[PDB]
Design a protein around this ligand. Structure first.
Ligand code: BGC
Ligand code: BGC
Ligand code: CL
Ligand code: CL
Ligand code: CL
Ligand code: CL
Ligand code: CL
Ligand code: CL
Ligand code: CL
Ligand code: CL
Lengths: 303, 303
């Protein structure tokens, strides 16, 4: 709704940008493992036909397994290339969507994959890392769990990259719509980012938007449920932005809008996006997977 | 709201794409002047510091003055370069915002300029043409007034350019939000386009969004008031897309969203867009100029 007591200048100076945003994280793996205090950490890589990059991402994280990281899983979304064998050969456990939750038939999309990994993992903390990253740095996982292990009351950590010496959906769609609908969340540098960590308590109890909606849906549901102070962001390093075609970005934008409208009380038409020059159509989903807590008691493998 | 009776495939095949969309207009200036039937035509060029291009745009239209076109005006928005003298030297009449409507102090933005030109022009038909166009073709005005003069019941004509052998705000923001909020309007190729014509009756009776909202606001208000059949589009030729910086586009996108939310019953926060890396803020307007018919009777120069 209408928030005339908040201005763009207020946001640019917001205290949250100081206490909850680490622009130069300096934690070490030893002291983070020290602060685990009995909490376990699961790392999850969603993967659909990522044979060229998945091993390289797994390798940057594998030295943490058995120490800081307790579980390192690639959640395979029906890949037909060599994603699975290469992930296993890089030291990761690979789980299909069917094995993660066999009672429910798989739907397409990233959100489905991450939702199912809630049922396949056991960590009190779950880190998500895209498996298409070309230049993954081995400090990703430690910088994402920093605030969850040390700071009090953080439940979601979004990892951002500073741009070198620009994601267009993020800059033109996600952040401006957040300015209009959830203005405090414009403090989050990269709301659509694929690198983030969250507590199991939180993630088990919110729905999962399907497809490309999942990241922004999780951000907005966390904010609505727990306030801005429950969210943090950390600099993961200097990744430069990878190229995608505008037609991909247009359909992705449509789903980002539907997922945001869904959480912000805005009635979405449900009509997919047509593109011309001729016609090219795409589809949008308006139904989330319900909170995974909903399925408790009724699974062969317990939660 | 929710429109489950309409699909993206329905839109890609919509009859409107046939009867109201001219992909190869063939009208001639002589037969269009023939069909004027006593209606006059005003052409308006909004202009803020456009000294390099304004004359070139005026010249492509000046041969029509006294024939098809009855008025050729550049509405100067406070330019400090040589926009005014160069427009006059190219054969156009130049009118400041103050001279167009002296009772009301000028607000910044394109929408303000076009709204004020309603009070400075007299044509039953008004054509708007951006004054920053690098390669303007002299068939622009004739192709825009085609449907208004010949076809029945058209009241708004949007001119589109086919891309050579892509506006990012149009493709990622305006068209996807229209898919969610006014799905029929995704049939319009370039909703944000600066080249369009409309009947005086229509334009006098709708508000004018300020700033970068004006084009999409006029499209949506026309659609709501008169239905899709009152709108047409025509191919103006092969213009390639000109470059703008993403930071411009981000603020422009924010205002497009606010203008669309305003017309579609969506409560906009009114908070401007902040951008980081640090902070850079911009502002958004939530107040339109009311329909110009509102001011009738109360102006020194009559309407
Ligand atoms: O699903 C949303 C999309 O956001 C993008 O910025 C990232 O590349 C991915 O996390 C994903 O493809
Ligand atoms: O105001 C909206 C903007 O739309 C853009 O596509 C055009 O270049 C102009 O008509 C304007 O700058
Ligand atoms: Cl099912
Ligand atoms: Cl599937
Ligand atoms: Cl992006
Ligand atoms: Cl919680
Ligand atoms: Cl005033
Ligand atoms: Cl001004
Ligand atoms: Cl554009
Ligand atoms: Cl009318």
């Amino acid at each position: 709704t209408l928030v005339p007591d908040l201005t763009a200048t207020d946001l640019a100076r917001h205290r949250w940008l100081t206490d909850n945003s680490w622009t130069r994280p300096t934690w070490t793996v030893a002291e983070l493992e020290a602060a685990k205090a009995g909490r376990t950490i699961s790392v999850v890589l969603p993967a659909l036909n990522e044979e060229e990059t998945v091993g390289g991402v797994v390798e940057t994280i594998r030295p943490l397994l058995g120490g800081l990281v307790d579980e390192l899983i690639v959640l395979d979304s029906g890949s037909t290339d060599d994603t699975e064998i290469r992930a296993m050969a890089a030291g990761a456990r690979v789980i299909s969507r069917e094995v993660a939750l066999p009672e429910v038939a798989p739907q397409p999309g990233k959100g489905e994959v991450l939702w199912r990994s809630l049922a396949a993992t056991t960590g009190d903390i779950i880190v998500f890392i895209d498996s298409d990253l070309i230049d993954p740095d081995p400090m990703f996982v430690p910088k994402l769990v920093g605030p969850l292990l040390l700071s009090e009351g953080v439940h979601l950590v979004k990892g951002f990259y500073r741009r070198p010496l620009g994601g267009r959906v993020t800059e033109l769609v996600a952040r401006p719509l957040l300015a209009a609908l959830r203005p405090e969340l414009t403090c989050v540098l990269q709301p659509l980012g694929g690198e983030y960590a969250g507590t199991r308590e939180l993630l088990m109890s919110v729905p999962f938007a399907p497809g490309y909606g999942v990241e922004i849906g999780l951000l907005v549901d966390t904010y609505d449920r727990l306030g801005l102070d429950a969210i943090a962001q950390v600099n993961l390093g200097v990744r430069a932005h990878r190229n995608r075609p505008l037609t991909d970005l247009a359909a992705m934008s449509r789903q980002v809008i539907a997922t945001l409208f869904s959480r912000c009380g805005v009635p979405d038409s449900g009509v997919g996006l047509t593109q011309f020059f001729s016609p090219r159509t795409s589809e949008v989903s308006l139904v989330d997977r319900p909170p995974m807590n909903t399925l408790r008691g009724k699974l062969a493998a317990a939660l």
